[PDB]
Paper text:
Purified protein was crystallized and crystals exhibited space group P21 with cell dimensions a = 35.7 Å, b = 73.5 Å and c = 58.6 Å and β = 97.5°, contained two molecules per asymmetric unit and diffracted to 1.5 Å resolution. The ZNRF3 ectodomain adopts a typical PA-fold, previously found in e.g. subtilases, transferrin receptors and vacuolar sorting receptors. A disulphide bond Cys107-Cys136, which is present in both ZNRF3 and RNF43 connects the loop regions containing the first and second 310-helices. The N-terminal and C-terminal residues of the ectodomain form an anti-parallel β-sheet, β2-β1-β7, that packs against helix α3. In ZNRF3, strands β1 and β2 form an extended β-hairpin ‘flap’, while RNF43 is three residues shorter and displays a flexible loop in this region. The two molecules pack together making an extensive interface burying over ~1,000 Å2 surface area. In addition, we observe stacking of guanidinium groups of Arg178-Arg204’. However, at present it is not clear if such arrangement is physiologically relevant.
Zinc RING finger 3 (ZNRF3) and its homolog RING finger 43 (RNF43) are trans-membrane E3 ubiquitin ligases that negatively regulate Wnt signaling. ZNRF3 and RNF43 contain an extracellular N-terminal protease-associated (PA) domain, a single pass trans-membrane helix and an intracellular C-terminal RING domain with E3 ligase activity.
Residue numbers in the entry: 56 to 208
Write the structure that this text describes.
Amino acid sequence: KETAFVEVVLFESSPSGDYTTHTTGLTGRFSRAGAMLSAEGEIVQMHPLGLCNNNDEEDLYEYGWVGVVKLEQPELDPKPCLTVLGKAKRAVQRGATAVIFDVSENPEAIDQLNQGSEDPLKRPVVYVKGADAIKLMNIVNKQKVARARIQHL
């Protein structure tokens, strides 16, 4: 399958040094234009405008982050700086191990994410929508650091 199982992990340390964790599961689909590989890392939420070399002097994240990007309604960004896959490629250049797109406000992006390339990304690009997107963004919009685990299967 092209199904991606995504686990989102919230964690707190204790004085003993042992962690308490809380996991939320959800499902998306791997883009055919990205790798069909598993990935894992700290979530970094980015506004889709942040993947433009606009303005900027933008943030350096430690290598290995999982980008979570909620697409805008296309009416709000009619002049996109890069294609949606281009923005994923840009994240990978900036150290992302994977990108998860919430495409619920731009479901037509799935057409581009389902279309193959002879220059595919070497890292996975997952899209979520529906209840799965709602589950993801509810956790990401909490104050807390979270880790994502993306599993092929």
